[PDB]
Design an enzyme around this catalytic site. Structure first.
Site, mmCIF file in Angstrom:
data_model
loop_
_atom_site.group_PDB
_atom_site.id
_atom_site.type_symbol
_atom_site.label_atom_id
_atom_site.label_comp_id
_atom_site.label_asym_id
_atom_site.label_seq_id
_atom_site.Cartn_x
_atom_site.Cartn_y
_atom_site.Cartn_z
ATOM 1 N N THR A 217 0.811 -1.218 0.000
ATOM 2 C CA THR A 217 0.000 0.000 0.000
ATOM 3 C C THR A 217 0.843 1.266 0.000
ATOM 4 O O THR A 217 1.931 1.298 0.579
ATOM 5 C CB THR A 217 -0.958 0.056 1.210
ATOM 6 O OG1 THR A 217 -1.888 1.135 1.028
ATOM 7 C CG2 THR A 217 -0.180 0.278 2.505
ATOM 8 N N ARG A 218 0.321 2.307 -0.643
ATOM 9 C CA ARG A 218 0.999 3.598 -0.750
ATOM 10 C C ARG A 218 0.044 4.742 -0.429
ATOM 11 O O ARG A 218 0.377 5.918 -0.600
ATOM 12 C CB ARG A 218 1.562 3.784 -2.162
ATOM 13 C CG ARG A 218 0.552 3.545 -3.290
ATOM 14 C CD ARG A 218 1.099 4.023 -4.616
ATOM 15 N NE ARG A 218 0.492 5.292 -4.986
ATOM 16 C CZ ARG A 218 -0.759 5.423 -5.425
ATOM 17 N NH1 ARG A 218 -1.537 4.357 -5.582
ATOM 18 N NH2 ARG A 218 -1.230 6.625 -5.732
ATOM 19 N N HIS B 168 -8.376 2.514 4.679
ATOM 20 C CA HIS B 168 -9.721 2.821 5.160
ATOM 21 C C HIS B 168 -10.443 1.506 5.452
ATOM 22 O O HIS B 168 -9.838 0.430 5.406
ATOM 23 C CB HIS B 168 -10.492 3.640 4.117
ATOM 24 C CG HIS B 168 -9.827 4.938 3.766
ATOM 25 N ND1 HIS B 168 -9.673 5.967 4.672
ATOM 26 C CD2 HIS B 168 -9.246 5.362 2.617
ATOM 27 C CE1 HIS B 168 -9.025 6.967 4.098
ATOM 28 N NE2 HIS B 168 -8.753 6.626 2.850
ATOM 29 N N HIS C 109 -10.013 -1.507 3.092
ATOM 30 C CA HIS C 109 -8.708 -2.142 3.214
ATOM 31 C C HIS C 109 -8.642 -3.101 4.382
ATOM 32 O O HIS C 109 -8.227 -4.253 4.226
ATOM 33 C CB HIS C 109 -7.630 -1.067 3.314
ATOM 34 C CG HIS C 109 -7.722 -0.056 2.218
ATOM 35 N ND1 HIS C 109 -8.409 1.129 2.356
ATOM 36 C CD2 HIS C 109 -7.322 -0.108 0.925
ATOM 37 C CE1 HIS C 109 -8.433 1.763 1.196
ATOM 38 N NE2 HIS C 109 -7.780 1.032 0.310
ATOM 39 N N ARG D 271 -7.603 -4.512 -6.999
ATOM 40 C CA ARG D 271 -7.933 -3.715 -8.176
ATOM 41 C C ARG D 271 -6.896 -2.640 -8.521
ATOM 42 O O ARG D 271 -6.477 -1.871 -7.668
ATOM 43 C CB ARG D 271 -9.308 -3.076 -7.974
ATOM 44 C CG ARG D 271 -9.864 -2.361 -9.193
ATOM 45 C CD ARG D 271 -11.039 -1.496 -8.784
ATOM 46 N NE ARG D 271 -11.156 -0.337 -9.652
ATOM 47 C CZ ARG D 271 -11.660 -0.378 -10.881
ATOM 48 N NH1 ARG D 271 -12.132 -1.519 -11.376
ATOM 49 N NH2 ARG D 271 -11.714 0.730 -11.607
HETATM 50 N N1 ADP Z 1 -11.493 -1.025 -3.140
HETATM 51 C C1 ADP Z 1 -10.533 -1.914 -3.431
HETATM 52 N N2 ADP Z 1 -10.867 -3.108 -4.015
HETATM 53 C C2 ADP Z 1 -9.932 -4.042 -4.323
HETATM 54 N N3 ADP Z 1 -8.639 -3.785 -4.038
HETATM 55 C C3 ADP Z 1 -8.234 -2.620 -3.459
HETATM 56 C C4 ADP Z 1 -9.196 -1.630 -3.137
HETATM 57 N N4 ADP Z 1 -8.547 -0.622 -2.597
HETATM 58 C C5 ADP Z 1 -7.247 -0.924 -2.561
HETATM 59 N N5 ADP Z 1 -7.059 -2.150 -3.087
HETATM 60 C C6 ADP Z 1 -5.735 -2.862 -3.205
HETATM 61 O O1 ADP Z 1 -4.932 -2.577 -2.023
HETATM 62 C C7 ADP Z 1 -3.538 -2.584 -2.385
HETATM 63 C C8 ADP Z 1 -2.867 -1.242 -2.013
HETATM 64 O O2 ADP Z 1 -3.745 -0.154 -2.326
HETATM 65 P P1 ADP Z 1 -3.183 1.274 -2.796
HETATM 66 O O3 ADP Z 1 -2.196 1.816 -1.848
HETATM 67 O O4 ADP Z 1 -4.280 2.234 -3.040
HETATM 68 O O5 ADP Z 1 -2.485 0.983 -4.180
HETATM 69 P P2 ADP Z 1 -1.086 0.544 -4.680
HETATM 70 O O6 ADP Z 1 -1.170 -0.781 -5.334
HETATM 71 O O7 ADP Z 1 -0.603 1.564 -5.646
HETATM 72 O O8 ADP Z 1 -0.161 0.443 -3.344
HETATM 73 C C9 ADP Z 1 -3.515 -2.874 -3.876
HETATM 74 O O9 ADP Z 1 -3.344 -4.277 -4.145
HETATM 75 C C10 ADP Z 1 -4.882 -2.419 -4.373
HETATM 76 O O10 ADP Z 1 -5.261 -2.920 -5.671
HETATM 77 CA CA CA Z 2 -11.675 2.069 -16.275
HETATM 78 MG MG MG Z 3 -4.441 2.185 -6.199
#
Ligand code: ADP
Ligand code: CA
Ligand code: MG
Ligand code: ADP
Ligand code: ADP
Ligand code: CA
Ligand code: CA
Ligand code: CA
Ligand code: CA
Ligand code: CA
Ligand code: CA
Ligand code: CA
Ligand code: MG
Ligand code: MG
Ligand code: MG
Ligand code: MG
Ligand code: NA
Ligand code: NA
Ligand code: NA
Ligand code: NA
Ligand code: NA
Ligand code: NA
Ligand code: NA
Ligand code: NA
Ligand code: NA
Ligand code: NA
Ligand code: NA
Ligand code: NA
Ligand code: NA
Ligand code: NA
Ligand code: NA
Ligand code: NA
Lengths: 510, 510, 255
Positions: B195-196, B200, B203, B289
């Site tokens: 995560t970055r 919430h 998550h 996603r």
């Molecule tokens: N609403 C969601 N539904 C499915 N997967 C999610 C959702 N929100 C976040 N994720 C997943 O949580 C992980 C970390 O999220 P995030 O920090 O926003 O993205 P990133 O992959 O750039 O670190 C990722 O695998 C992302 O696809």
């Molecule tokens: Ca799209």
């Molecule tokens: Mg993302």
């Protein structure tokens, strides 16, 4: 009552048809020009609008001298505070009587044309002793020797326009305007209340007793010119004033800002305030405990007696031509939940309570609660807003010269550490390189609530440029705010010392 | 599972008895020296601790090339993201194979000694197209052409120490350390969550489902190195993370910070993340996603499909040697008050709700409320703290060049006007005089919440130096943020235009 | 006035009876609303009695009952007018209605969900919540299935120590019944007291009747287990997580 001297010296009105002419003159490539200082802009505006009636320019040596040794103008008119145009030797040397000087504001707005009568070099010591009582810590005395020019230029004035103001545009009523205000409302009895601090419950109650005792309407006439260094800024105060005015019964009080430059000259100042208020149209003037006094000097001794002002005003009673409503210390009564003059209660069979300014300053700085009974909640909110508790305050950590560890690395370490705490403060490693254009910003940041990490000290010659508030020195020196054990002390050790220091001083709260 | 390639390349451990020797060499007056860039410090730390196993230095042309066209190292090892030491022509010209370079951090801390194998000049267009999909707005492509050096230096590394960090000291576990952590607790099944952004409700629920589905403990492994420009800073996020971890049942989750420098390389990046997490000791890896995707380009088109990462990871399934726990868009269900994967609900007979990042960014900026169901209140508080609503934000007003009125007077007018509003913001007339040492402070002040009044524009050549955020231009120009009617417009008129503009933008609230 | 009557949930017949009873008690009028004295629907979802069968039967016995009947049509809520009214007096076409059914209410009470200010009076809801606590306040029992092959003693302690760290006010106990009904009959007293019981093993089928099935979950490899194990030999820590997450998924634990 009639204005002091009998004639309202509204020179703006007097010189109306001269404006275009004076303006041209003020803007000629040959006239001598002086850009007014802050207090001078304060004084000149009170001269040009009749606030300093009978005055119509800055005092010449004759009038100045009499005011200093006689508390009267040369002609005998009661007048306690000297109002002079202080310039430097350089400018002074170009002045000759009969000369006409264009007085500007911000080197851009032409205010008036001064017709020189004389150029003298006052004995600041006498003025200090005779007018301000000689204590070097006295606000007026410090200004006198540290800010005021050494040469006074006396002379008559010709108005072009009053100093420019872009804030509170309609609230700065002139004597004539205010007089017109009271009139349109048919107010033939008005008691004026002077003030340079925020108003709390005691004030509201005292001004209302005045209104009731005097059978007169209330004029909250706060000073927005210059007061005492360290006072609450006038913007915050105007807000406090506009809010508290809503606590008075509908139609009983009027708020008008007075662009006066105080002198904190206790009793002499009170006499002066009464004269000024009379000029502004007041029929009564309040004089409470330690009126216009600057408190005590560092030694804890009083600059003026708590009622010196009341006594001096009383002695000039039949001359002032404005009714004085004196008040004894107005305090709080827990058990009866009400305020009242100390001279009306038996300090023996009744308990009193009082949160002093010092005490209040302190609560505001710690985020402490201020009693519902002390001040109105909206007032306190406004105060806290512009006088935030430590956890919201800015600060600066200076890596002392004695420091022997890597300044770069210690800087980063302090930065990364502060960052983890979170909470909303902005942090920055601030390198000044002794450039005053930078040093002068240190307080702007502290003022903005930011935490600055300064890699090294600045030349002593530049020290004046920096505002010492919330500026702490990290060094092995005995005179360091955060004292290190040794110049080579390991970084993590230093970091903890600093963190704990800041946390002990309210900057950090976990 | 075993680290990628089978051997954990913890070079700190490997080169332990060479430290003193390497140190001396790194500090000799004859060795070539290169001060690592931010992303390079992120990469080298993952190389030196075995996080990038099998890698043991920066990729040479052979390995680099294979990764670009094959998503594999030359030897066939599955590897999608190229990790290279990019330098400039100047430095490159002093390099020869067999050469030894000392790689420093902050020009002070000796990190490692690189033994050069080759010096090549990559074709940034191919890397852009083949590895990052060629869209110029793509974060990795922009960096590639705008920040990355044009010459790559391949070579083996010899560890001296990992990059220094003064924040979150014990939380940045190394692969070996984390592995020991899991072990001491007897965790033989751990599902890692990358995560970055802040976490919430969705998550927390999705990571718990993973833990339940996989029958494994939870590792919240957030990225604190480099992410996407505009992301919430890692400090604010670490706080969000430490807070949200308390919402999981006692003993189910572990937090460890990963100093990785992301590339926002969607699917390729996911494959890479899985390899990294495996090296760190995870048995399972979540891929939800749009994993590691940078969203859409200005034209609104997707950089990666919402499930491209999942599909790529799935195709490399039997090679990754780490179990992938895929998730479909996890959304909110109002009527059932719960979250669930979109693929498990009938988007026909059940209603879903979703506050997107954009939407959230917006609420935070307007001080809008964030649903109790969206995130935990403590999380939102922390976010608001470091991403304040407009009435708390800083800004800057720039007196355009077209302006014909007095800049001094307009500046003062704006100053005095803002001052009367009160509310806690600090204001200042900031003259930069085109000195970059000053221009570079404009954003520090905006960042500190201050309102700056800038008397005039700065040379176009210096424009880069200033951060455009909350910086508004007052001018007659069509491209002015606050457009003036005419260059000679009266001050009071301009002041009202500016006030109302700022009030319309949430900076002022009455 | 409290009536110590033993209802029969005999819809329409019962209504006629209630009217007779109320008349004996001194009433001059008797209310008969929607589905009076009806037990709702059977598991198949079909009505035991029509929503107005009682009203109709009472109406047919009208001149005999000698007590006046005040019939009512489904009294529902009107959001926009913020008021209640008989459904037969509103145009279910040009006016919107709202209704929280018993099932719905039972549900909210069990999840700690909010009950609209407009639905019932707050003091009423408080009293209801008091004796019908939300899951995080409810008691339960975990039963180590017979198929289990791991150490029952050790799994019991593991579950005990684990629940203990969560804190929050619930009382936990490893409860050995040894098939003694005098003990089996206490299982629900504890669940009723809000306690979490860890039961080392099942009880004879012949004794099953003795135990109240509510909030009693079976941990086993069996397909018919509430918390199904992967295998009888599944490692303890694995089982513990499965149980914890199950209980948390069911509102018993809230973090
Ligand atoms: N609403 C969601 N539904 C499915 N997967 C999610 C959702 N929100 C976040 N994720 C997943 O949580 C992980 C970390 O999220 P995030 O920090 O926003 O993205 P990133 O992959 O750039 O670190 C990722 O695998 C992302 O696809
Ligand atoms: Ca799209
Ligand atoms: Mg993302
Ligand atoms: N507690 C008090 N009792 C009586 N008078 C008071 C009290 N507090 C303030 N005053 C009076 O209110 C007026 C304005 O107060 P303040 O601004 O604090 O001082 P200053 O006289 O320097 O303007 C003065 O006349 C002062 O003596
Ligand atoms: N929403 C409603 N509309 C019309 N009648 C109602 C409604 N709710 C309850 N009643 C009536 O109130 C009386 C008592 O309600 P209740 O205790 O639920 O049923 P029971 O008839 O089994 O005692 C019954 O006559 C019932 O039909
Ligand atoms: Ca001098
Ligand atoms: Ca005293
Ligand atoms: Ca030493
Ligand atoms: Ca280039
Ligand atoms: Ca014009
Ligand atoms: Ca039905
Ligand atoms: Ca087995
Ligand atoms: Mg003025
Ligand atoms: Mg005072
Ligand atoms: Mg590091
Ligand atoms: Mg019923
Ligand atoms: Na008179
Ligand atoms: Na100028
Ligand atoms: Na003397
Ligand atoms: Na009188
Ligand atoms: Na005295
Ligand atoms: Na202390
Ligand atoms: Na393996
Ligand atoms: Na350096
Ligand atoms: Na695709
Ligand atoms: Na394998
Ligand atoms: Na599996
Ligand atoms: Na708008
Ligand atoms: Na029927
Ligand atoms: Na009858
Ligand atoms: Na009747
Ligand atoms: Na579920």
């Amino acid at each position: 009552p009639a204005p002091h001297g009998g004639i309202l010296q509204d020179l703006i009105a007097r010189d109306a048809l001269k404006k275009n002419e004076l303006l041209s003159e003020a803007q000629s490539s040959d006239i001598l020009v002086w850009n007014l200082t802050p207090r001078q802009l304060c004084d000149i505006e009170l001269i040009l609008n009749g606030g300093f009636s009978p005055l119509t320019g800055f005092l010449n040596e004759n009038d100045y001298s009499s005011v200093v040794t006689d508390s009267r103008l040369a002609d005998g008119t009661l007048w306690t505070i000297p109002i002079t145009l202080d310039v430097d030797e350089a400018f002074a040397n170009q002045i000759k009587p009969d000369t006409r000087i264009a007085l500007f504001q911000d080197d851009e707005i032409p205010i008036a044309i001064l017709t020189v009568q004389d150029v003298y070099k006052p004995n600041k010591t006498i003025e200090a002793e005779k007018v301000f009582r000689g204590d070097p810590e006295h606000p007026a005395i410090s200004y006198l020797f540290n800010v005021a020019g050494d040469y006074y230029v006396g002379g008559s004035l010709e108005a072009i326009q009053l100093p420019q103001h872009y804030d509170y545009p309609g609230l700065r009523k002139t004597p004539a305007q205010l007089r017109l205000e009271f009139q349109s409302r048919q107010w033939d009895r008005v008691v004026a209340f002077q003030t340079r601090n925020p108003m709390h419950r005691a004030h509201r109650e005292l001004t209302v007793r005045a209104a009731r005792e005097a059978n007169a309407k209330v004029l909250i006439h706060p000073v927005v010119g210059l007061t005492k260094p360290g006072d609450i800024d006038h913007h915050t105060r105007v807000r406090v004033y506009q809010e508290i005015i809503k606590r008075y019964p509908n139609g009983i009080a009027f708020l008008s800002l007075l662009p006066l430059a105080m002198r904190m000259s206790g009793d002499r100042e009170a006499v002066w305030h009464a004269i000024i208020r009379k000029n502004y149209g007041a029929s009564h003037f309040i004089v409470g405990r330690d009126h216009a006094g600057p408190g005590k000097n560092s030694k804890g001794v009083d600059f003026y007696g708590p009622y010196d002002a009341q006594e001096l005003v009383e002695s000039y009673k039949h001359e002032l031509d404005i009714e004085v409503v004196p008040f004894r210390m107005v305090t709080y009564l827990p058990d009866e939940d009400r305020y009242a003059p100390i001279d009306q209660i038996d300090t023996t069979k009744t308990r009193t309570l009082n949160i002093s300014g010092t005490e209040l300053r302190r609560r505001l700085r710690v985020g402490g609660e201020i009693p519902e009974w002390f001040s109105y909640p909206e007032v306190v909110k406004i105060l806290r807003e512009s006088n935030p508790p430590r956890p919201k305050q800015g600060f600066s950590i200076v890596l002392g010269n004695s420091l022997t560890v890597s300044r770069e690395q210690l800087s980063i370490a302090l930065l990364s550490t502060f960052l983890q705490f979170g909470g909303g403060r902005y942090y920055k490693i601030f390198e000044h390189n002794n450039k005053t254009e930078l040093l002068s910003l240190i307080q702007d940041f502290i003022g903005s609530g930011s935490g600055l990490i300064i890699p090294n000290q600045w030349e002593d010659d530049k020290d004046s440029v920096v505002g010492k508030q919330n500026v702490y020195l990290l060094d092995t020196s005995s005179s360091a705010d955060i004292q290190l054990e040794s110049a080579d002390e390991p970084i993590s050790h230093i970091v903890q010392k600093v963190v704990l220091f800041l946390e002990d001083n309210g900057f950090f709260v976990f």
